[PDB]
């Protein structure tokens, strides 16, 4: 199959102190708890961190006014009193029984000044210059936690286009799940003394140009800590 198809609000516009509701819609029919949809925040220069996973969990020190549901045939991300920080690009996933799926991203804007309510760490290096049909070892350094409690994710982003999700790995067991779009391209694999999460692409085309990000998860949680992502430019 593979053709599911997750779709966002384009952009939603609000007022601070203002309750928003973004919603995630599936194509193949309601949004079920079966899909464990999380919220993905991106702020300006592609920062990313998860707000909520499984549905409604909360990922660690996600502002009280941001809480997930299911409202109807649909997964929604409701602000109850939004602030001008909250001016971002949300995008939801869904779990589609072996992979994920990203909706196209909801564009918050936050008109008028206004008031509101005021550790982990990957380290993912900036650029990879790559050449047509070699290959590539992205690394994901992690501080902060115990490494082998938490599953790793990669996603790749080409910019303006949207987020795929690639795949997962279990540090402490090496199990791993591939999209299937990824399953020959990607490899997965970990150093637990480093702390280090690798991705290998073999042999590179130029679509293979993008950023590449990893982030934390936690089974039924959010995609909680995201790395800078990897720019990979592949040399034409």
């Known amino acids: 199959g593979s053709q599911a198809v997750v779709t966002q609000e384009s952009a939603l516009t609000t007022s601070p102190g203002e309750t928003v509701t973004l919603t995630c819609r599936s194509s193949t029919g309601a949004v079920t708890t079966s899909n464990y949809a999380n919220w993905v925040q991106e702020k300006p220069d592609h920062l990313f961190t998860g707000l909520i996973g499984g549905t409604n969990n909360r990922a660690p020190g996600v502002p009280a006014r941001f809480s997930g549901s299911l409202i109807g045939d649909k997964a929604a991300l409701t602000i109850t009193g939004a602030q001008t920080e909250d001016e971002a690009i949300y995008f939801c996933a869904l779990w589609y029984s072996n992979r994920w799926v990203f909706g196209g991203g909801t564009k918050l804007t936050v008109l008028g000044g206004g008031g509101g309510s005021g550790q982990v760490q990957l380290q993912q290096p900036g650029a990879e210059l790559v050449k047509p049909g070699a290959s590539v070892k992205l690394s994901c350094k992690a501080s902060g936690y115990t490494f082998t409690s938490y599953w790793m994710h990669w996603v790749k982003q080409r910019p303006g286009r949207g987020l795929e999700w690639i795949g997962r790995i279990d540090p402490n067991s090496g199990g791993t799940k591939y999209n299937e779009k990824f399953k020959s391209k990607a490899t997965l694999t970990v150093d637990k003394p480093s702390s280090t999460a690798y991705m290998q692409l073999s042999s590179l085309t130029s679509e293979d140009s993008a950023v590449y990000y990893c982030?934390?998860?936690?089974?039924?949680?959010?995609?909680?800590?995201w790395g800078q992502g990897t720019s990979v430019t592949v040399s034409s």
């Open positions: 982030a934390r998860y936690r089974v039924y949680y959010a995609m909680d800590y």
